[PDB]
């Protein structure tokens, strides 16, 4: 009936629509506190790396960027 979407940013079956995408719950909060580019965000490599687990204390910038990649909006 409808393709199953998931945490467009970093997890799995999103609890539902919040930003405008089937995004996560907790990691979703990270995005709320991180919206807007202006931020001292940065990855310990800035090279390449897939974002998944939360921890909200590791690839935080790739997460954010990925969140902006998701195409969300604080809402
Ligand atoms: Zn997530
Ligand atoms: Zn990274």
Q: Which CATH number is 14's domain given?
A: 3.30.50.10
Handedness of CA 43, 52, 69, 75 (dihedral sign): negative
Number of domains in the chain: 1
Cβ burial of 36 (10 Å; 0-12, 13-18, 19+) is: exposed
Distance 53 CA to ligand 1 centre (A): 8
Q: Measured between alpha carbons, how far is 41 from 68 in angstroms, rounded to an integer?
A: 13
Distance 41 CA to ligand 2 centre (A): 10
The technique is NMR
If residue 17 lies in a helix (H) or strand (E), which one and from where to where?
Answer: strand 16-17
If residue 16 lies in a helix (H) or strand (E), which one and from where to where?
Answer: strand 16-17
Range of the domain at 51: 1-75
Written as six digits, the tokens of 56 are 């909200």
Distance 9 CA to ligand 2 centre (A): 13
């Amino acid at each position: 009936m409808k393709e199953t979407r998931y945490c467009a940013v970093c997890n799995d079956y999103a609890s539902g629509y919040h930003y405008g995408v089937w995004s996560c719950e907790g990691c979703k909060a990270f995005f709320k506190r991180s919206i807007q580019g202006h931020n001292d965000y940065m990855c310990p490599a800035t090279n390449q790396c897939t974002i998944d687990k939360n921890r909200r204390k590791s690839c935080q910038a790739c997460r954010l960027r990925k969140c902006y990649e998701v195409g969300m909006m604080k809402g």
